[PDB]
Symmetry: C5
Subunit: 376 residues, 5 copies
Amino acid sequence: TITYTSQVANARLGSFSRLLLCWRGSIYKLLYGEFLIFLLCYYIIRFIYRLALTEEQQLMFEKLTLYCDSYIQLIPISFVLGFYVTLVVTRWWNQYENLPWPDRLMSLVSGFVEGKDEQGRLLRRTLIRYANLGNVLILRSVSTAVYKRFPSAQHLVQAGFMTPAEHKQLEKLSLPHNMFWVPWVWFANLSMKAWLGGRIRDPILLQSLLNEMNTLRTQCGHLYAYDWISIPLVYTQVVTVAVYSFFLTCLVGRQFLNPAKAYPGHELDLVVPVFTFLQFFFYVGWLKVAEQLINPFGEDDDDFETNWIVDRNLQVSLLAVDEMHQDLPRMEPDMYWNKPEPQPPYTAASAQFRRASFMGSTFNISLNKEEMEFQP
Amino acid sequence: TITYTSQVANARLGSFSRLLLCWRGSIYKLLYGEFLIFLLCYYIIRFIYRLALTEEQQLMFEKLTLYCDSYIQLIPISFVLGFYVTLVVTRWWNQYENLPWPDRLMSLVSGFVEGKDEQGRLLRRTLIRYANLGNVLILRSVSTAVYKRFPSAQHLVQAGFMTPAEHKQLEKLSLPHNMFWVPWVWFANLSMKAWLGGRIRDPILLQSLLNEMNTLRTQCGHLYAYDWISIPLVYTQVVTVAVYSFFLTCLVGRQFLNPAKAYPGHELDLVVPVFTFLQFFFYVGWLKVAEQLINPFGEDDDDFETNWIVDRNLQVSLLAVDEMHQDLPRMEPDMYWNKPEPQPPYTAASAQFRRASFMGSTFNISLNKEEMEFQP
Amino acid sequence: TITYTSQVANARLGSFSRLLLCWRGSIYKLLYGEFLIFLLCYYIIRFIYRLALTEEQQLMFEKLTLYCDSYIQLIPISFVLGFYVTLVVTRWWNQYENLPWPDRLMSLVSGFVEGKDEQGRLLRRTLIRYANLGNVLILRSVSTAVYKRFPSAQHLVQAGFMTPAEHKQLEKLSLPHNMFWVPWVWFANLSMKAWLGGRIRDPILLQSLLNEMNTLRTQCGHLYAYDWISIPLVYTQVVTVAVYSFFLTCLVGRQFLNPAKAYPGHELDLVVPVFTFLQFFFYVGWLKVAEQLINPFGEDDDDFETNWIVDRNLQVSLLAVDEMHQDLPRMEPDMYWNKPEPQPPYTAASAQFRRASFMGSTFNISLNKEEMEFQP
Amino acid sequence: TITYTSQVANARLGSFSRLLLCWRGSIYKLLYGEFLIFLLCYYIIRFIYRLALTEEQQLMFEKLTLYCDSYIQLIPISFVLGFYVTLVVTRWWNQYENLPWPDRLMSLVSGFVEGKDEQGRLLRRTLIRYANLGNVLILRSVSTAVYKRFPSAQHLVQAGFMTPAEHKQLEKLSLPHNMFWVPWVWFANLSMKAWLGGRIRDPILLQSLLNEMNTLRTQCGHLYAYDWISIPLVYTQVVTVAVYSFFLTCLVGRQFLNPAKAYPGHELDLVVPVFTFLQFFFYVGWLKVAEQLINPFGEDDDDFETNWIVDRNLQVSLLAVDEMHQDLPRMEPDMYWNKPEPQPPYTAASAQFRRASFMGSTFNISLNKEEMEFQP
Amino acid sequence: TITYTSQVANARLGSFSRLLLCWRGSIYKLLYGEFLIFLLCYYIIRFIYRLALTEEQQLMFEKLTLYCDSYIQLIPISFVLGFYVTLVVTRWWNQYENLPWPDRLMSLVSGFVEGKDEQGRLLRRTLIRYANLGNVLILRSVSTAVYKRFPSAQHLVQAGFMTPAEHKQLEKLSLPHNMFWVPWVWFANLSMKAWLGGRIRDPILLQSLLNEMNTLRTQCGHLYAYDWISIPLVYTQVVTVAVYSFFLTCLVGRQFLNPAKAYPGHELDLVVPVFTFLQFFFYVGWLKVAEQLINPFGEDDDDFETNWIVDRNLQVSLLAVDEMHQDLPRMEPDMYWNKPEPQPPYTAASAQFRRASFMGSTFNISLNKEEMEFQP
Ligand SMILES: [Ca+2]
Ligand SMILES: [Ca+2]
Ligand SMILES: [Ca+2]
Ligand SMILES: [Ca+2]
Ligand SMILES: [Ca+2]
């Protein structure tokens, strides 16, 4: 994930222009190899045409170049790319939206599961750990970075996500399917046990806990679904062939023909087909954005930081349920205890952001005395 | 369903190019027969024109070819295809999103329905079985693969989804409508009986169970609706006629006329209309993706694995409610029992994915001492 | 509603081509009259030009035909049609999604409202009948087919949706607004009475009932809103004028001029403007799909089966709450009572749909012994 | 709001054509003044060119007309308009979806708040009145029609939406912000008081009431947000300049040059630029639809009927909570008391809408005896 | 945020035209510097060509200008810009939708947390303050204006959002991540303490409070996600390069060549390339709208008023929970106490907005006596 929010906070002079000097997660990184292959092929073709063809063979090559340049427009590259890239971007944001965060559940566990003794500590930690374990099992199923971190359940045990007892229980339950669902059943059973044992004081609080845990389970299921049900291979193949065929046709249709022949479009003979290179940049860059976002859980620069999310979730959820349980700042009267209209100060750098309240669009409408009179 | 998530995890050199060597669920599989028919017709027309026409008749054919090539652009093939394919893809992902998974309900049943004795086992298994039976009844209504597996309710009884008593009850209730709704009414009644009999300890837990079951019912209803309310036949017919008319016009408009006549666009006479073939590939491939996804519950390669989903759901839900009921791993203090900042290790293959926390876009903003001062 | 899901289950050879032999709810049915009017006008114009004009008058007509053919492209027919048709299709699927189904509510009523005696029967039937009556009142407000079935509240009483007492109560409550909301207030009051009378054992179950009933009320409100707030007349008028002006210009711009004049585009003189006819087919077909779906509750072939939905809802809801109340199949141990990995059989027609479980995209990643080692 | 649902119920011959004879909320009403200004300017320019220019000055004007006609295509009017109009239409339907209806809340208040005595009447009326007052305060903030009806809180008191005591309380609470939120805090406090006083029998019912009231509050907040956060002025200015520049260029580029000069596109000299007028109609009509829907709470013909909604909501909510409280039709056995398959009759006008139930797409699949056999 | 809702309430003559005289948050403000740079470069190039080139060098420049003008169309500027701007606008409205408003929570806290004594005051104020503190911590993480107001937690303490005890607790809990989540855990714990201490009378009300607080937490998480996961840099770079390359090509391709050469498109030699300037206006204006909305929490004119929202939320939430707690207007019978059909008056300015109720589209359908008869 490359963040440039801070850079683009204000619309300034060449705001996006200053982003063209970025290498990490950039268009240049995505397509320099493809571009180099295309450039090598283009110049090989030019040198063959200019130094390994007789007059009649050069006339044949020129006729073919005119034909290819004329019929390039048949390829619906823009239409295919637009459809495909919109679909990939929509899926990409959905996939992020379905990353499970234990924050709601961890506040509920911290609050509802009672006891500052060792049994309460153990119970709260085990519940939040079941949520983290379920998340990590799905994430190592669908993310190459998480898989390379935890290539086995023994790795998960060594990293502290699973205890040896949990690992043995998983092995005993083993079915011929992904077992990422097991920690949710464990969570439900342990929450029921906590309520029956008096650690959860009310079935309403038990219901709240299970609702949060089930939300996380649905998010994990969506992640599994996106990893399983790929964008149809036929769509991917259509877009790939469109782009490749366009820029293979360009290799012959965008050559600089002999200016002596004074062809209708070939009066000026540059050496660098700058507009062909820009077209390659735009269209192959569109395809490269699709390629990078099609699996947002790979190891691209703009792919999600799944490992960071796993680490942060573990740290925050454990802190919240264990150390922050019934551990509050002293409740004292605040700065505005008897001020009916609190007005927090502004700094010299923010004084210009003090605004009068917007009171609705109708506020400034003006009416006469007779206009405002009620009729019988 | 063809999955290539693993292949497209990272944007590499010709990432999508390597997907053109896939046969299963590919564009070649979808349109080789149509393409062969088109090629045969194109070459029959070429041979007729070149070997069964006098000079004047060949001049007439050339005038018709120029006319057809000129007026091909009248067909709004791209506009029609774009609309239609976006609609089909949206429906396709909705249809997947409405496949019922018993995971939420099965965690709730495992937890809330009490008793390790035979009556508790029977009750939990029967509730989860009612959820599975409702799902399978809708799936065999809307999916050809599931129907071919279970072509009758007697097949459902032989496969263990329904008991003979349930089959008799369904026959007694028979109305002139799809009866996929019956297991939900059975579930509600059996849950009420379980709560009245003390197996469910609280009406709040009963409410949670019924909410999960009703979510599944709404998903099943959406599946029924998508199977019933097809995309309007008029839209389908418009797109079909557009594509067919375009590539029937091409058969005469894309012939290679006599290069002797030196026509404005006909200077070079290839034998293979490569750009016409690429256009056929793109446009008929778009139509073929729509054709494959229009009913995602058929037996295409990229259609959903409904039979696998049925099997997995049955296995997982039965395991969760029966064997995993009040059967938890031993609760022991975890690896980070007294570590306030747990730091799971990285492997040598993942050490590069260790990232500093993103602390917000404003973190690196720099201000002066006077800028940061509060004003009165 | 025309269903062809079964026909389009698999992408086969000319899958959509076989749908062009459908008459009911077809493009031919939608625009044969318009097409015949257009054809008659086109040929009247051709005959006038060819048999009722002098040489100079024919030259004037030819200049006008060239001018019209040149300036046809000014009309943004495709852009206007695309916007309009996307809007109509989105509204159409929303309108279907807001058709109220009593299934969730009827399972809750069957379960929660207790008593196998006459008072319990009466109470459950009356609650589900209030839900059906609310649905039917909105449906006869917004659907021409339902209105023609029930052109008065006396018709509703004769059909059994309303009792004479309910009809008198509605007449007493009469306000100068659509009264489709009344049965929801009746439902809330009768549910409160049932809970106070002991027929509903818990306020949590009462809350569940009222939540389901209120969901139905919100769906009915959405139906009312779509019937009231039409797509803006200005959008409709813009699209209509675009299509009509395009095909009125075509009547003069697409005539076959005298081939003697050998005009740049008029070398070949057919009698049938086939490409103009195809353009009419596509564009007027797009407009006709919009026309048919703009009110999906009319009496078109592809309009919703509101009458069938009303009948089915009444039958199913009454059966569910009355006959199926506390009437369950015998609970006996299932086929897989002691089989930890149930494997339902496959038929010979479905054996090919047996699939290995997808275990996640990272499953086949290969790593070295040193790659998988944790670092300190 | 102009409704034509009834007119467009069925796709008939010239279904949309018959809508071109509508004046109220029509394209002609929206752009006749702009069109008249454009026509006057066009003909002033034509008369200047034809009667106030020498030969050389007319040649200069003709060169400028050819130049302008050639370079008209540079303006991306269609692209800008498409984006803008889609955005405005999406916002418009959201704005309607966020109009608060008290129906759910009023059924809950009617049911849950107990007592047929004066205190119960007063309590129920006051709660529903707080919901109506909150709605009206936001609506008079964001709607010009509602503001012109209630230009002051004293107007609200005179119209009966607020009591003098409520007005005094609002004045006492006055902050420098829109106070539309106050009635929600009043509602929460009065509901708490009703539950503590025994008028609400259970905290679950209190929770239901507060959930409905909070849904209304979120809708009101969305209305406030749409009124405050306008579509960006930069988008609006871009679209306006595109359309204006296009039709100012047209004034000189679409003149009929001297047919004597026999220019490539100027052979025929009409007096009325019919295609320019149609382009103005389409493009300015698109802009006018955007202009009308950008604030759907103004006083356009197609703007929302906020005043009617306010009146209806007040009447219906008061009736529901006061007169309809515990006031039900007599519960008697219905028409189908002992009919397991109720079949409501059809009229002669609806007999054709009787349909057989759709039983799923797989119903008609045919299989052999060996195909349907289970394999071991 | 620039609001012009009031200006665009009604579609009037040149409704959007009157918005072109706006400077704040306008297209002119966004791109005057870029436009001036472009104009300076264009005229430098013109003067170089006309005053620093020999005849042959001018012929070379003219050939290059024709070549560039011909090949400008290769850049898919419109397609790239459309995709990008739609994505930015969608994200922008989502970002606004995820701004947390404490209104729902504050009504629930005002109602449910009991006690008019100092402990009740303190408890209610502390809960609402935890909600405000969580909101402000996320807002200063993601908003430059809020950060410049509160560049440190010590600033938050001085402004009254945090007490010194809360600041010390945050420092003690410090992890290497954004700590905006901490106040939600504090809220959950303090709500649990309030319920155990009798200040919250029921666990159902506790559940309601925690649901509202968790909704706010999810909104804050969405804000964090949008600030972290930027639109992919590759998309941004593609759009930037497209626009820049288009208007750098224009600098040479849109020069006025020597009219003496009488080139096909260069007959008339203006000095100002008006259509090039309009294209710059449109396309760079599209890019500038994207640039301004890409981070809606910067300090642009059309950026959100985060500081105003923070101030208003603090003031309103404190007033609601403290002064408005169990402080209601006197409950007296309303204006329509015994009026079954209340009819609030209209003013002379609003009498035209009195409308008859819309009773559904089927209301005016006419049927015969035989049509309306039920058949047996
Ligand atoms: Ca990737
Ligand atoms: Ca299929
Ligand atoms: Ca219709
Ligand atoms: Ca308006
Ligand atoms: Ca900004």
